[PDB]
Structure 1
Amino acid sequence: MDDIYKAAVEQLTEEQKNEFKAAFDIFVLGAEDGSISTKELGKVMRMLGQNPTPEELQEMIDEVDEDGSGTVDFDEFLVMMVRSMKDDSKGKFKRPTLRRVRISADAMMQALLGARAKGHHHHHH
């Protein structure tokens, strides 16, 4: 990924990396290679209530696939989380376009992370 994103991944503390790593494992749940691909990508999207097609799944991976690997590995999935975090920027001018569907990284992470304790009423989630 980008040098900046790469640094961001390394910057994350043990807890931060562990927190993100949880999504990676869940994302590649059953993944033979262990990386997140379109098949795995769609699985996570389904959990979030999204059902993107294979074409969309590959495109989504490309977003975090600077190397054009086509898949989101441990370092790649971390970049996605970092990308959304950016310099504390969210954006609201994007509006529904060239997609019509917007999924927040934080919301997605909670969907994947929220599979153990709590999750019934968030509360400090």
Structure 2
Amino acid sequence: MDDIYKAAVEQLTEEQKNEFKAAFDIFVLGAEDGSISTKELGKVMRMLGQNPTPEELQEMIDEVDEDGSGTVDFDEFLVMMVRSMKDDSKGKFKRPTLRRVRISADAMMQALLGARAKGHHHHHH
């Protein structure tokens, strides 16, 4: 959990936090810990059209899980979304060998939000 990523979470207004909070609750649907785990990840990813395995699911969480928690909480959840945005938005550093996982974090949110097709006002974009 980098300070920059942490700041990004706090940089979110009440509406922004509320919107993400809703996704978090859904993400951890049935979660005993309340954090996004492999079980929750698999279900969420399944909706996105993915079929990752438990080992793969844990790896994903590990991507945003810097504390070695093993699960993605509210902090990691926002960080994961911010991480992707920060990349295209900035993409500073960029280690060698290139980066993998072209999965769109925004795309996942759309699946999680659902809304019977009409996910939020289309005018918002």
State TM-score, norm by structure 1.
0.83
CA contact (8 A) 1:61 1:71 kept: yes
The alignment covers a number of residue pairs equal to: 125
Consecutive unaligned residues of structure 2, counting only runs of 5 or more, are none
Structure with the bigger percentage of helix: 2
Q: What percentage of residue pairs aligned between the two structures are identical?
A: 100
Matched residue SS, 2:87:
coil
Distance in 1, matches of 2:96 and 2:53, equals 18
Once residues 47 and 90 of structure 1 are traced to their aligned partners in structure 2, the CA distance between those partners, rounded to angstroms, is 29
**Gap change, CA 1:94 and 1:123, over 3 Å in 2:** farther
Q: Deviations over 1:35-81 (max 9, x none)?
A: 11000110100000101001110000001001011100011101011
CA RMSD of aligned residues (A): 3.6
Aligned to 2:83: 83
Report what 1:56 is aligned to: 56
TM score, norm. by length of structure 2: 0.83
CA positional deviation for 1:118: 2.4
Quick one: structure 1 residues 99 and 82, their matched pair in 2 at CA, closer, same or farther if it must change by over 3 Å? Answer: closer
How far 1:88 moved relative to its partner?
Answer: 4.3
Taking the aligned partners of 1:111 and 1:20, their CA distance within structure 2 comes to 13
Check conservation: 1:38, 1:61, Cα contact below 8 A: yes
